[PDB]
């Protein structure tokens, strides 16, 4: 499973490539899910938070 | 074939459609519409559209790509 | 009837052509150039169709 | 027994056939109508009962043959106009 | 050996409806499935039947093919007289045309590794209207062959260039990373007559008489509607006498046309009354007590 | 109505000339080619 | 074998080629063999062969040989890729009904097949409706299908 | 660690997910057509998922739309503003 | 060998008897457990299924490469009604014709625990149909073999024929357990 | 198979037919198209039952479309110049559920009624052209009109003129080809005047058919005989040298150039 | 009853035909049985998908029949994963008519759906009727004293389609379907079909009465009871009250047709005027 973990982390580095779009977390819903407002003045709903623990995020 | 041509043209009305505002009819088949994106466009009107409904300040659905009155 | 059928099939392709902007003419220029104001997008210097 | 064209029974026939006085005919039809044995209405001024429906009963083989004979006439009438509408409206028939 | 543009993908009537039903139910998810059939020759790919794959989870994209689900369904379909191999896969594109994205190209490479002539069929259940389904069949272009200066497939006929490629597909890599295979439909007499039963009313309805109270009320209302329309129709005649030819259509925009509604009211009433009269006259002899 | 419809005469105008012109229809194809050759790249 | 078409007997699954109404003393294994041993039946001369191929295979011709004593076939109905109960053969549509004549059933006669209908044959069943001399039982020889794999 | 693999694998499934445009339902036109308005954006005539209740999509309901098709995924509760959230969760100081 | 089998369990009224310890129904539950396991170990691709022989034959489980579900179904099998041997074999024959793998060989296990109430002609014609279709049915003649020894003899002899060795007519006299006679029986051999 | 049938046209040789039928019966897509066409060439005008029964019977059994395409052309040649003796076959082919066999009936009408001007045959081709389910059969129905009207060339630019502007591009292509087939080598001004707008048709293959048809009409023709030959000669060059034109529009232009100056300006096309 | 109407979608008909054409191949030509999938909306069934199940029966004996119910469960779970909202609503079989053993099969299917609906889907293209005949099992309580038995009660069946389903169907019927015929022509064709349907059904009753008359079939006394009701409902169109009302109604509709025809002629003359003005104006400038 170690090769699977390392190969998995490689796929993250491609998607975690810069630039990132700076955004502000608006909400944290349950049905675990987040609502963010991008710097392009766009409100989005994220069915999954992403690569950051939902406990470490606040509005 | 005319009925088939009429029926197959309706795919121009497939969702999603951006909502505009009918401002002025330039001629029979073209009009000036104000998209909710904030831009005024001179576009074409679908021939299968009841022009009796194109009242001033009427909400119209525009093609998401071509802004045409569909 | 045939032209009416033909116009209908070509209409589907013609409706997919992108619509035209609406602008206000500031002043005509030389070499068939015009200074226009696109409604949300400010001013442009544009060419004029041959017709 | 009577055909649907002549289902207007007088009070005299009900009185005579049922061995009851004419004045008791009306109450007899009420029981029949209330229970549901027969359907219709009573015309007291003309001393007549307008009968519109009877409880279906058991038929012999012979009466079933007669019932089928009515179907043969009924089938011909339906077929006759089926060919009539087809012939008359042939141009516009899809 | 080079593929030919004369190659055709034949989709049965059953296979077409299942992809449309599954694709529409799965809007907007790119719901995928397997196309069963038989590679008849180097120029035909028959799609006899398809079966839909489950969605592993949320996400508007094509998920990986589940081998156990594929193996179990193929094994069970063989038990009911369906011993047809998988000739490709189908997935839905709900409204943005028929093409292959980056994910779909990788998904197709999985099938092309197993079967070199596997076909990726894309169905647009949203843009498909009656009498015209937005469908397309794609197979990948090997980048090694095309970069060196070779056409992806040889052209020996006109059959491969009858359908003009769409700009939406040409934008998303058509004729660069994948090519389109012309799609024909296998329809037999039995399946056509069976589908003709759709919207076929019962024989009771033909002889059924509309309620006379509502028929008179409908006749009452519409005739009253023409009373105002006729009054407006007179005004339209005088107005159009003194109207410039540029206003024959512009001035009719947004204002109701008395002539147009008069014809519709006339057409509705004459269809309504003639049918009611004719059906009533037929019933007087058909349902006759004598 | 049938007599009036049968009396409606169409002048022998050059049909299929109100369709897309050959030169104008050629304009779209070249412009659309650059749309595919630039936006996709 | 005809040029360009091989003998497909090695291609078939020997373990998986079943027979119906076969006398135990001479069976399917002796049938495929080139030697003298045959495939006789027990219940009646009527008999149903089932042959399942390893890979998709086209059948160009067959050599369904029988002894000239009269027990050889005179009516062969061939069925392709059935999804067969000795009553279906009575009333069904054979792929190519074949009246194997005395020339066809001898040691040298080959029987041509409709190559159009024999293209994708994963499993084939051959039925012997009637023999030549109206005997109680039938007898077979090295019944082999001549053709090429689908590939 | 087995748990480490699960967290990394859950990460991979998370990466495939795509954000959804937040809007508001304005009026249900047909049984399959809706008018929605983006939070800061135009109004569209959009569709809806078959699995959705479609009775909770009353006018004014906040919804999440696909980025491509703009179809309604789900109805969301009334949005609490981040500033309003900080108003409610503001420590007085145990006075 | 690669063969598909169906067990023709008996759930008639006579299965309530204690002639086979403790109950003929309980005796056959152990017996089915042994034959179902025996076929599994012969080849892992072996298919087994369960059919009842009640007043109306009921297919409790079709062919499946599982053993627990066969004993799971036999647990709820309660004695009711009368044996119908005529229709049981045919219904079991029908399930065999619709096996998962056509390469498998026909096989039926019959647990006759009640007399077969038909003329010998019906049993004879039934065997020929199985023999034509290469269907082998191993019948265990426990219970009322004093009256069933002749009807079933016409079955196996017509089915097996001369030098058959395809269907056996093992008749176990009443004793401690009929399953104990199965491991020495040619059915599991 | 193509070489044998081309070298055995109308010979009615049993050995050639037997060998070719062996290749056709192999049910191979590539060789089936070849054998089917060659079968008609060898049995050209023979109208024998056996060739018809074997070929049409094969078409209703083969599952390969290429074999059907070759047979469709082949079946027509079997009954070439057979006048009304092909009525029984034509009605059998035209009523067929197979689109290609329906196309064979159109070709059979063309060959059985070549140059006869039979209005009954023209009535049938026009019916299929305007009312049919398959565009290929419609395109072949209009194409077959040229074979019936070449003996009277002035008549095609009147029956086909209206089909030249139809909504169906396949009928438009057929109208172009019908003018080319009927007016081949005649330099018909009326036919060329119909094809000149076709060369700018929105559909690419319609343009190709007009370009090829234009070459067939005025092969060998000079400026005096036809004033428009110089216009089309430059049009062929312009299409070929147009990097932005469709590839099959150029295919017609290139073939038009070869036909226009075929045989070193010493050959002509004339079905009569 | 528990089922008011069964709506069978065109996918099921195509699937059932394909089931019959792939099992009823060179093997045999019996009836094939599958499992119906659909949803429930108020009291109208919505049969929308189906899958085939292995099935066989004896031609002679009706009590001998096999249905792979384990196959039923395995594919249902296979189908439930793709579309959870589509549950088992019954079974189908392509038999041209009912069979004696369907009541036994429905009992097997009743375990997976208590209100199981059997839909007989005739693969043969019948000319006048729908191919679907939807039946539900009911417990008929006889009044003669005969013990209560399980019987099939007819449920009115209709062929309806989904939005995308109808899109594909119109694509497959694009060429064959003739939509040029106006509404009025279609309605009259419905009346002709209504006359044909009634004649066929009247012929079926007459054929049944013929068999009863000659003793081929026993006297039912429930059909005959119903038949008296049919003949009693036969209206008398010779009554003075009815004829006057019919004339009163017919004349009421005629004046509306006369008014609409009168308006049509005026509008037609207006069109002719515009055409002649346009024609005259075009030639004046040219
Ligand atoms: Zn995709």
Numbering used by the authors:
A (entry chain F): 69 to 99, 120 to 147
B (entry chain D): 71 to 140
C (entry chain C): 52 to 102
D (entry chain a): 283 to 376
E (entry chain c): 23 to 312
F (entry chain V): 487 to 527
G (entry chain u): 119 to 201, 204 to 271
H (entry chain E): 36 to 130
Task: Give verbatim lines from the article.
In both datasets, 30 s and 2 min after substrate addition, we observed non-substrate-engaged proteasomes in the RS conformation, with Rpt3 at the top of the staircase, Rpt2 at the bottom and Rpt6 as the seam subunit bound to ADP, while all other subunits were ATP bound. Interestingly, although our cryo-EM dataset showed a higher number of RS proteasomes, TXNL1’s tail was not detected interacting with Rpn11, likely because of its incompatibility with Rpn11’s Ins-1 loop in the open state. Instead, the PITH domain adopted an ensemble of conformations between Rpn2 and Rpn10, whose classification resulted in RS.1 and RS.2 states, with minor lid movement and no changes for the ATPase motor. Local refinement of the PITH domain and 3D variability analyses for both RS.1 and RS.2 allowed us to separate two major PITH domain states that we term forward (49.8 % of particles) and backward (40.5% of particles) according to the PITH domain rotation, along with a smaller number of particles showing the PITH domain in intermediate positions. Thus, in the absence of C-terminal tail binding to Rpn11, the PITH domain appears to form a ‘blurry’ interaction with the RS proteasome, using just a few contact points on Rpn2 and Rpn10’s VWA domain to swivel between forward and backward positions by ~91°. The forward position resembles the TXNL1 conformation we observed in the PS proteasomes, except that the C-terminal tail does not contact Rpn11 and is, therefore, not resolved. In the RS proteasome, TXNL1’s PITH domain makes transient ionic contacts with Rpn2 and Rpn10, yielding low-affinity binding with at least two orientations above Rpn11 that may allow dynamic association and dissociation. Titration of these stalled complexes revealed a dissociation constant KD of ~35 nM, whereas TXNL1 titrations we performed with RS proteasomes for cryo-EM structure determination let us estimate a KD in the tens of micromolar range, at least two orders of magnitude higher than for the PSs.
The 26S proteasome unfolds and degrades hundreds of proteins to maintain proteostasis, regulate cellular processes and generate peptides with second messenger functions. It consists of a 20S core particle (CP) capped by one or two 19S regulatory particles (RPs) that gate access to the CP proteolytic chamber. It uses its C-terminal PITH (proteasome-interacting TRX) domain for binding, while potentially reducing disulfide bonds with its N-terminal TRX domain but how it binds and is regulated remained unclear.
